[PDB]
Subunit: 449 residues, 3 copies
């Protein structure tokens, strides 16, 4: 890429940041209970828990049935001693994809640990606090949790005798209906196929009043640097057991790790408007260019957080680009398109290493040190301001200082090769393909002559 | 649609679902009280209600004057000779659509029931609980409802003498300001034209801590199956009255239904990457094809929820394709477009009726029962794998089992034909336009002579 | 623009509203403290504040360091003959934009007032109420506030001795993790550079349970008409100080004003389907047209709220419109394009000042004064209906009355030109990609002839 020619056409080189992709995740098993274990409220709680039980058993049972169905198709013990592993009975599958097979293999791998955690069902159902830990093994422990367990251990407990029992039953019914609305909201897409659908950690967090940090801390991840504090919205987890007896859900989550792709640097750009042909124009370039070993491609940070120093993505998002755009970035400013604007929010000046790139035709350019106006050149449109002209500069309204030097090439004396203009592209451009069509079927009429 | 040549072009036939959408327009009517009724707080409440009342008086009166204007835009009379009424006022609508006329007919249809509900205004204001059902007639009822009644019947009521009265007044002001912010949030677009704008049941439930099925069970809808349980976001409804003295809003909602359009089957597809020209490609076909008696249309599930077995839409969303797409799906794989990718997240193999469609040029394909590689034929690009080759297949890393049979013919032994790709960013269409600019007078240079 | 031919192609003139732009905002300074001042809880608080402080220091300290680092890059003083201008040291900026320069100038303006507010740090940290005021000067005041100060002044305070101190400590821990997650949620993009990123009042109010007009009333701005009730989602604020001692942020917010651009009228339109060629077609014209002294342009309401009488935007969003669309709106219905629709939710009739535009080919049309049907003319598709034919009209299933007159000339008796249909696919481009290439040999063939 040539920054001098692309600055001649009106694009200024922005920051350079890194690219990091999530990769190599380890697994951790969590358990979530659903039944609010009340021990203090055995005086006045009545039958009303069983209505909540009937409403949650409408969704606990079919998820568990599909979960035991999907783990039933796979088997182990490949024929021959040389070949061994998990075998998917694809005749019993019907239609399946690669990630579904991978999830089936993962569930078959975690079936033994699911049975190991299922051995502690009475330990799961005996908890009376919000979040606590129980000894899974000699070195492993579980992370049982309920957000609403605290709500009938710090709010509804002290009103055990001041307030009437039917009012406690009605308030518990309102809270249970609201919580069942929350579980109904979060396990929406999970109802179709609860094996191949990951669970967002924030969607888990709205079950517990939107506290993602409690799940992050009790899960074990402790973000310390600046880069991992923004990260935490990409933690994925899958359900491995859906037990109906204690009415609990055993899930397996993936602890992320931000690996770094070698040699890939994300380069940003700033687009300014320039006055050509009596109109204001902007070059048509993408904002972000990934560069890796003299190779230009495209990415999208639609799902990626952007730090001050790097681009952090959940997964690699490499998109191809047109070779005409590659020639536009490399040498050919004639191959770069331009669009027109007339709105008031167009930047005309910007700073780059102490060098001002400014359109002086619309912006007032002056030097404070000499008190003389600066005129637009006719060989260029974008006008540079450095310490060669004047140190202390009047641009627009503002006093500024400049610094450094162009380095290699001055685009003031360089020729101008602004390419063809493009228009706006709504469904209007399909109507211009329509009048291109009538021009072409005029030429088809002129073919026969 | 032929699935063998569509498997040759790179598409795999996915699941088949239904289009059981829309239903009978049975309705129901409820009452939304705004001012909460305090009865235990007659000791220490001051006149903190007056600021809330002055805040809501700026809201309630415009909807009331708009609705009485809208009733002034219609009469019935008995003009003509066969017509016994239901005429609209001439030119009093100004600018109006068909849905506005339908809303006019709806208010003229329900004004008698609105007067019937308004006959018990003193019965409306005497409620001191959250949700009540009061008898409209002999076998009829409505639902008067106040979700913040509980918060000043279980939280602010017991602190009547423990906490100081000015602190209760301040906290009451805080929750009144918060709840008035909630009404200002939910009746945002409703303030412009409060007769033709429906009300989302989820945004209505957001006034009540997001307890949707509390409103649903108080309404009367009891979804019992899997398909209708996810449904409940298609309730909707329109306000029929905005009474100022009781400060309440009489709402009319529609009880939905799920009828089935006959013969319409939604078909899913899986698009895999194939290695042609030393490059990775995918075919360009839409994901869902609706088929009804040899008729292909297009749909968009931008709002429709997807069940495990069918598609639930609020309303029919039929779209067409080009006839070139119809020939692409029927017989012409040369008319099916393609796209080039280089990203890592491209699946290359999938399963369909125990038959593997695999890109073995990039995927390791072996038979574990015989320990031999599976090689790509030069005639095919996508490899069919069944039990005729080998029962246990190594694909990728995984042991899998195949089964069933082929189905008519195979896609491997068929001829393959392909076409050019194209993308967005119409600067290439701009160069094509300049090509037309030079081309049309490239024609009229040396035709004759 | 005409409305006779434009309704003859099927577009009906909607309401005419105004255009207003937010302009000239003044500045007011607020302060936001973050450490919850507990005074009643000195009996049982333990050291749970220390973990919250350790969590929030990693956010507070680098924001303050970046703020003072950006503060160092601007200097004042006289550049020889010029008096002042706040000279920006451009060597200490790297790459900067115009908005960043304006923000640096804003903080250079606000350093003195930030120091004046920072002189009352012990006054800031001593507040034990939710929202209260302190005297900044003889005529200026500050607006120190918390949404969660009340929560440990009305909820956790009365359970000082009834509930155990470790349960109070755990409840405070859970609520502090939840609120620390709230600050991590709202200050997401602010951590990259906390000077150039504006702060929305909505996400700020999300820290205080979504009570927007509590913040608005503490600011002092008050809405009084219909147009300012919907306005309230566009308040812009910027960080001016990030003090780590009392752990508070001094913020400067911009109280706005809705200025009116003169002569600009936003025109809406209603597009109906018309039956041509045995099929339903939809004309392709934009819904909104801004007209200002015979000047058509394009706008987008992607962020602008729409009131009953005007358009309220955060900033001007004028876009150029095509000269082919200028011929479409002025004279040439051939330039007005079309598309082919088949879905059932297409309106075919509408009312405009007692003028019925009705496609009577698909809609039943009658006059029950005479009890006869109304037929379709061959010279037009859209049916003109006024009181000259019959004053009381039957359209579809609805019985209406009309008035007024035609409007200059009737839109039924003329003949209008037509545009071609379009689609939403790049297939056409690929067609031409080889088409013009094939027709190129044909052009030379004409030359050969
Ligand atoms: C999940 O897998 C289990 C285990 O069965 C094994 O896997 C199947 C896929 C087949 O390949 C089996 O041959 C294989 O053993 C299946 O559970 C089994 O279900 C059957 C009924 O389908 C049960 O038989 C019943 O048993 C008693 C006998 O007294 C009577 O009630 C009935 O007469 C009937 O025969 C059987 O006990 C049960 N268990 C075992 C170990 O075979 C299961 O069908 C399968 N699928 C699902 C969806 O759960
Ligand atoms: C909505 O409609 C009511 C009812 O009036 C009926 O509908 C109107 C659209 C017109 O077609 C009327 O002719 C028709 O009766 C309107 O309320 C009426 O408003 C008028 C004033 O516009 C009232 O007249 C006043 O009455 C007393 C007489 O002592 C004095 O205060 C005034 O001198 C004045 O004459 C009238 O009483 C009232 N009611 C009726 C039954 O006619 C209403 O104006 C209309 N529009 C709106 C915007 O509310
Ligand atoms: C922000 O600015 C302050 C003020 O410094 C002034 O502005 C800077 C932008 C430069 O132009 C300075 O020349 C100018 O004075 C900076 O504080 C200063 O930091 C320096 C170190 O960077 C301190 O020097 C130290 O001082 C003592 C001397 O006994 C010893 O510890 C060291 O040997 C060392 O020399 C200096 O005292 C201090 N104050 C002043 C008034 O200069 C500050 O660093 C700067 N930037 C940031 C990121 O905070
Ligand atoms: C409440 O429950 C706790 C925990 O089980 C127990 O220690 C306490 O004694 C109970 N109190 C009453 C009054 O039941
Ligand atoms: C593009 O640039 C190359 C050198 O980088 C040059 O040879 C070529 O002619 C240019 N093409 C244009 C300006 O169209
Ligand atoms: C640009 O070229 C001019 C002559 O046109 C020359 O005076 C000037 O020094 C050049 N600038 C450079 C090489 O930076
Ligand atoms: C293109 O033009 C031809 C000839 O006028 C017309 O028949 C055809 O429908 C048009 N096609 C498209 C896709 O615009
Ligand atoms: C509180 O209100 C309820 C319901 O109206 C009533 O039964 C009760 O007596 C009231 N209590 C007091 C102390 O006013
Ligand atoms: C595929 O075609 C080949 C010849 O090209 C033939 O030998 C083979 O039997 C065919 N397989 C089918 C029809 O399944
Ligand atoms: C290209 O330009 C104009 C429109 O700008 C068009 O009318 C003309 O036919 C085209 N060709 C030439 C040779 O100008
Ligand atoms: C609680 O704090 C308030 C306000 O500072 C004070 O008036 C009151 O005495 C305190 N009460 C106790 C029990 O400490
Ligand atoms: C466009 O309209 C003008 C008058 O406004 C007319 O002279 C001209 O012929 C029209 N052009 C068409 C229909 O192509
Ligand atoms: C429409 O044209 C007819 C002649 O075809 C004429 O009689 C009639 O008055 C016209 N209507 C107008 C101009 O409104
Ligand atoms: C059409 O011709 C142009 C110019 O030679 C070429 O760039 C383009 O690839 C061709 N398109 C096809 C599909 O052959
Ligand atoms: C497919 O069949 C159609 C006729 O139905 C034909 O026009 C097309 O060329 C065929 N596909 C080929 C040979 O590319």
């Amino acid at each position: 890429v040539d920054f001098e020619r692309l600055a001649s056409i009106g694009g200024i080189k922005g920051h350079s940041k890194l690219y990091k992709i999530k990769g190599h995740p380890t697994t951790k098993d969590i358990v979530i209970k659903l039944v609010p274990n009340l021990n203090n409220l055995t005086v006045c709680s009545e039958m009303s828990i069983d209505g909540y039980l009937n409403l949650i058993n409408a969704v606990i049972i079919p998820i568990s049935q599909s979960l035991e169905l999907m783990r039933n198709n796979v088997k182990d013990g490949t024929p021959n001693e040389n070949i061994f592993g998990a075998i998917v009975a694809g005749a019993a599958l019907g239609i399946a994809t690669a990630a579904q097979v991978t999830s089936v293999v993962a569930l078959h791998k975690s079936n033994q640990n699911a049975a190991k955690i299922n051995s502690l069902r009475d330990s799961i159902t005996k908890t009376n606090q919000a979040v606590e830990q129980l000894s899974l093994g000699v070195q492993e422990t579980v992370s049982v949790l309920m957000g609403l367990q605290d709500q009938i251990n710090t709010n509804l407990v002290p009103k055990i005798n001041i307030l009437s029992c039917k009012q406690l039953s009605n308030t518990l019914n309102i809270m249970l209906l609201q919580y069942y609305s929350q579980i109904l909201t979060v396990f929406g897409p999970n109802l179709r196929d609860p094996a191949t659908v990951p669970v967002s950690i924030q969607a888990l967090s709205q079950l517990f009043e939107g506290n993602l940090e409690l799940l992050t801390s009790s899960l074990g991840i402790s973000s310390t640097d600046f880069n991992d504090l923004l990260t935490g919205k990409l933690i994925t987890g899958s359900i491995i057991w859906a037990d109906t007896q204690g009415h609990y859900l055993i899930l397996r989550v993936n602890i992320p790790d931000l690996i770094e792709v070698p040699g890939a640097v994300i380069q940003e750009f700033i687009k300014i408007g320039y006055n050509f042909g009596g109109s204001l124009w902007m070059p048509t370039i993408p904002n972000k260019i990934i560069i890796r070993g003299y190779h230009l491609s495209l990415i999208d940070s639609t799902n990626c957080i952007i730090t001050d120093n790097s681009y952090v993505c959940d997964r690699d998002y490499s998109l191809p680009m047109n070779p005409i755009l590659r020639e536009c970035f490399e040498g050919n400013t004639s191959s770069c398109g331009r669009e027109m604007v007339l709105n008031s929010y167009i930047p005309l000046y910007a700073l780059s290493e102490g060098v001002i790139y400014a359109n002086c035709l619309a912006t007032s350019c002056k030097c404070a040190t000499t008190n003389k106006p600066i005129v637009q050149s006719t060989s260029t449109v974008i006008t540079m301001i450095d310490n060669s002209k004047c140190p202390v500069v009047e641009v627009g309204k503002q006093m500024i200082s400049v610094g450094s030097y162009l380095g290699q090439v001055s685009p003031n004396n360089l020729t101008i090769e602004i390419g063809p203009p493009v228009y706006t592209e709504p469904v209007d451009i399909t109507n211009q393909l329509g009048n291109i069509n009538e021009t072409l079927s005029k030429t088809l009429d002129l073919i026969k002559q």
